[PDB]
Design a protein around this motif. Structure first.
Motif, PDB file in Angstrom:
ATOM      1  N   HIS B  28      45.636 -26.348  27.172  1.00  0.00           N
ATOM      2  CA  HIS B  28      45.733 -24.995  26.404  1.00  0.00           C
ATOM      3  C   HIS B  28      47.169 -24.108  26.562  1.00  0.00           C
ATOM      4  CE1 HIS B  28      41.395 -24.847  24.974  1.00  0.00           C
ATOM      5  NE2 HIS B  28      41.143 -24.926  26.430  1.00  0.00           N
ATOM      6  N   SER B  29      47.818 -24.575  27.561  1.00  0.00           N
ATOM      7  CA  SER B  29      49.250 -24.251  27.924  1.00  0.00           C
ATOM      8  C   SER B  29      50.168 -24.527  26.640  1.00  0.00           C
ATOM      9  CB  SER B  29      49.740 -24.666  29.275  1.00  0.00           C
ATOM     10  OG  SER B  29      50.135 -26.066  29.119  1.00  0.00           O
ATOM     11  N   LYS B  30      50.739 -23.554  26.223  1.00  0.00           N
ATOM     12  CA  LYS B  30      51.730 -23.417  25.110  1.00  0.00           C
ATOM     13  C   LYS B  30      52.984 -24.299  25.288  1.00  0.00           C
ATOM     14  CE  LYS B  30      52.963 -18.551  26.058  1.00  0.00           C
ATOM     15  NZ  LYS B  30      53.262 -18.519  27.722  1.00  0.00           N
ATOM     16  N   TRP B  76      38.977 -26.374  31.590  1.00  0.00           N
ATOM     17  CA  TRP B  76      39.775 -25.002  31.428  1.00  0.00           C
ATOM     18  C   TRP B  76      39.427 -24.651  29.854  1.00  0.00           C
ATOM     19  CZ3 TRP B  76      43.590 -23.117  34.108  1.00  0.00           C
ATOM     20  CH2 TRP B  76      44.098 -24.176  35.088  1.00  0.00           C
ATOM     21  N   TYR B  78      40.108 -20.431  27.496  1.00  0.00           N
ATOM     22  CA  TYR B  78      41.025 -19.433  27.350  1.00  0.00           C
ATOM     23  C   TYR B  78      40.349 -18.056  26.950  1.00  0.00           C
ATOM     24  CZ  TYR B  78      41.649 -20.593  22.580  1.00  0.00           C
ATOM     25  OH  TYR B  78      41.326 -20.806  21.092  1.00  0.00           O
ATOM     26  N   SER B  83      44.041 -13.946  25.456  1.00  0.00           N
ATOM     27  CA  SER B  83      44.793 -15.213  25.627  1.00  0.00           C
ATOM     28  C   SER B  83      44.924 -15.562  27.190  1.00  0.00           C
ATOM     29  CB  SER B  83      46.170 -15.157  24.923  1.00  0.00           C
ATOM     30  OG  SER B  83      45.818 -15.570  23.387  1.00  0.00           O
ATOM     31  N   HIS B  84      44.441 -15.210  27.950  1.00  0.00           N
ATOM     32  CA  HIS B  84      44.383 -15.351  29.444  1.00  0.00           C
ATOM     33  C   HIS B  84      43.766 -16.741  29.782  1.00  0.00           C
ATOM     34  CE1 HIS B  84      44.101 -14.593  33.724  1.00  0.00           C
ATOM     35  NE2 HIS B  84      44.667 -13.305  33.631  1.00  0.00           N
ATOM     36  N   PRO B  85      44.184 -17.466  30.541  1.00  0.00           N
ATOM     37  CA  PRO B  85      43.700 -18.792  30.991  1.00  0.00           C
ATOM     38  C   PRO B  85      42.417 -18.790  31.957  1.00  0.00           C
ATOM     39  CG  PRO B  85      45.641 -18.672  32.235  1.00  0.00           C
ATOM     40  CD  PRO B  85      45.573 -17.431  31.296  1.00  0.00           C
ATOM     41  N   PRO B 124      35.595 -27.450  21.302  1.00  0.00           N
ATOM     42  CA  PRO B 124      37.162 -27.614  20.824  1.00  0.00           C
ATOM     43  C   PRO B 124      37.612 -26.487  20.151  1.00  0.00           C
ATOM     44  CG  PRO B 124      35.815 -29.289  19.821  1.00  0.00           C
ATOM     45  CD  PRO B 124      34.898 -28.911  20.712  1.00  0.00           C
ATOM     46  N   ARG B 125      36.657 -25.849  19.196  1.00  0.00           N
ATOM     47  CA  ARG B 125      37.167 -24.863  18.230  1.00  0.00           C
ATOM     48  C   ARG B 125      36.948 -23.266  18.849  1.00  0.00           C
ATOM     49  NH1 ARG B 125      38.476 -24.670  13.771  1.00  0.00           N
ATOM     50  NH2 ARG B 125      38.123 -26.408  12.095  1.00  0.00           N
ATOM     51  N   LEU B 170      35.435 -34.348  17.820  1.00  0.00           N
ATOM     52  CA  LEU B 170      36.784 -33.715  17.694  1.00  0.00           C
ATOM     53  C   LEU B 170      36.825 -32.457  17.149  1.00  0.00           C
ATOM     54  CD1 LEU B 170      39.181 -36.541  16.532  1.00  0.00           C
ATOM     55  CD2 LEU B 170      39.595 -34.831  18.387  1.00  0.00           C
ATOM     56  N   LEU B 171      35.769 -32.270  16.050  1.00  0.00           N
ATOM     57  CA  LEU B 171      35.672 -30.698  15.348  1.00  0.00           C
ATOM     58  C   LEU B 171      34.696 -29.996  16.033  1.00  0.00           C
ATOM     59  CD1 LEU B 171      36.440 -31.474  11.453  1.00  0.00           C
ATOM     60  CD2 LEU B 171      37.903 -30.430  13.087  1.00  0.00           C
ATOM     61  N   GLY B 240      36.679 -40.714  17.358  1.00  0.00           N
ATOM     62  CA  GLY B 240      36.524 -40.490  15.952  1.00  0.00           C
ATOM     63  C   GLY B 240      35.078 -40.372  15.481  1.00  0.00           C
ATOM     64  N   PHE B 296      45.509 -36.679  24.239  1.00  0.00           N
ATOM     65  CA  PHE B 296      44.872 -35.810  23.288  1.00  0.00           C
ATOM     66  C   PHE B 296      44.967 -36.296  21.896  1.00  0.00           C
ATOM     67  CE2 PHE B 296      46.075 -32.929  19.616  1.00  0.00           C
ATOM     68  CZ  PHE B 296      45.097 -32.155  19.514  1.00  0.00           C
ATOM     69  N   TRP B 297      45.932 -37.239  21.476  1.00  0.00           N
ATOM     70  CA  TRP B 297      46.069 -37.817  20.195  1.00  0.00           C
ATOM     71  C   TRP B 297      45.147 -39.272  20.209  1.00  0.00           C
ATOM     72  CZ3 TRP B 297      47.977 -35.124  16.697  1.00  0.00           C
ATOM     73  CH2 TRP B 297      48.968 -34.099  17.032  1.00  0.00           C
TER      74      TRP B 297
END
Ligand SMILES: COc1ccccc1CNc1ccc(-c2ccc(CN(C)C)cc2)c2nncn12
Lengths: 29, 364
Positions: B28-30, B76, B78, B83-85, B124-125, B170-171, B240, B296-297
């Motif tokens: 989640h870290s930017k 993990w 947030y 927006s705090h972890p 994930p959402r 994924l979704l 997938g 991730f990918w």
């Protein structure tokens, strides 16, 4: 075939998740 | 052919000397922020920062008040307001703890599971939707914003033995669970019933009503099979619309419900068929409780073995036998690698072991 179709679904769906991650600013730890 | 190369830049032993069962990088870290990961083992939760020249910087250590606790998992999230972890951890006690990683204070906890929790996963959402899977044969979906139990996945056609793992797709429209009953079960959470249960948990206000929140009891999965493995299924993840799952036969099986052309969203709950698409073979990983991971990918797959070797495959290579990368090995890493985690940008891969050691592999 089924591989290329699965990869595209992963590509499209991780791009959706990546755009949502990009639009947020989570505090550093 | 696989291109991925790594080098072991560092290693450390945690002072407790107890097995490390979990490791998770904070995805989640930017972009630009330091790469942080958590490890769990014993009644300990420990946070680290990854720096240049293979440095692993110790940040904070959470020691549970219960000396008998054995953490098995962490995830993990947030705070959707600040927006705090946040970090969720659980294990032997069957209690979920939401810890403020910055202060190491246990913010809140969730009692309810009848036995130990084997895995925690955040939707994930939606960062407030937490899934927990238990030795009590059930899965539970929690809304950590309203402190409610949204649903319990178990009962009549639920798992018949301990649930070992689960993964959202994924979704976040569905969950695949797996356990000691050799089955892999599908639970759709995008169904009209479940989406309404989710909406309801959000509208629940305890300072508006005195009535308790009523959780859904999902007794029937949307698909079930015990036709993939011949023993306990201890790890499951979505690839997938396909599934990756493992047992003790030194292979991660790639499969899908129904016949080859069947759409995941069109399979009926009574679907009796399954299609095995391939296998990622490895050796000396026949004991229970070894997790595999993806970046991730989803271009990389990693799995550690009982003897400290770390297997990596390139998921962009169609034949799983041609997908194999060079096995990540170090002569000083001889203990069982329980779990690995890739950093969000997949530049770092961390392995954690039975002898409390942490190993850092940097991508070349
Ligand atoms: C890596 O983690 C998982 C992987 C897959 C599925 C679930 C989990 C989390 N759960 C979990 C992990 C490890 C354990 C264990 C493993 C070994 C030992 C014995 N010593 C002496 C090495 C004690 C407890 C566990 N016992 N009950 C649950 N356990």
């Amino acid at each position: 075939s089924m591989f290329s179709s699965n990869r595209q679904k992963i590509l499209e769906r991780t791009e959706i998740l990546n755009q949502e991650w990009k639009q947020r600013r989570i505090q550093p730890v | 052919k696989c291109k991925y190369s790594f080098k072991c830049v560092n290693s450390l032993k945690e002072d407790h000397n107890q097995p490390l069962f979990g490791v998770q990088f904070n995805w989640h870290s930017k972009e630009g922020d330091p790469l942080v990961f958590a490890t769990v083992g014993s009644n300990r939760v420990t946070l680290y920062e990854c720096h240049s020249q293979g440095e692993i910087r110790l940040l904070q250590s959470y020691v549970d008040a219960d000396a008998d606790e054995n953490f098995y998992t962490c995830a993990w999230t947030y705070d959707s307001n600040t927006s705090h972890p946040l970090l969720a951890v659980a294990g032997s006690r069957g209690i979920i703890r939401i810890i403020n990683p910055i202060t190491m204070q246990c913010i809140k906890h969730y009692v309810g599971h009848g036995n130990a929790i084997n895995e925690l996963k955040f939707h994930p959402r939606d960062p407030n939707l937490l899934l927990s899977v238990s030795k009590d044969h059930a899965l539970r979906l929690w809304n950590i914003q309203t402190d409610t139990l949204v649903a319990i996945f178990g009962g009549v056609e639920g798992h018949r033995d301990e649930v070992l793992s689960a993964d959202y797709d994924l979704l976040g429209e569905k969950i695949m669970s797996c356990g000691m009953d050799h089955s892999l079960k599908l639970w759709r959470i995008n169904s009209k019933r479940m989406m309404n249960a989710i909406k309801e948990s959000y509208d629940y206000n305890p300072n508006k009503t005195n009535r308790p929140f009523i959780s859904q009891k999902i007794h029937f999965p949307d698909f079930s099979t015990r036709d993939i493995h011949r023993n306990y299924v201890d790890c499951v993840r979505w690839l997938g619309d396909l599934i990756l799952s493992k047992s003790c036969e030194n292979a991660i099986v790639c499969w899908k419900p129904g016949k080859m052309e069947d759409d995941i969203d069109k399979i009926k709950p009574s679907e009796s068929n399954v299609t095995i698409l391939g296998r990622f073979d490895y050796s000396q990983c026949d004991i229970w409780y070894m997790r595999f991971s993806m970046d991730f990918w989803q271009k990389m797959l990693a799995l550690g073995n009982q003897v400290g070797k770390l297997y990596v495959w390139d998921l962009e290579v169609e034949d799983p036998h041609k997908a194999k990368c060079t096995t990540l090995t170090h002569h000083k890493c001889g203990a069982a690698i329980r779990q690995t985690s890739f950093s969000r940008d997949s530049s770092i891969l961390i392995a954690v072991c039975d002898d409390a050691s942490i190993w850092r592999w940097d991508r070349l």
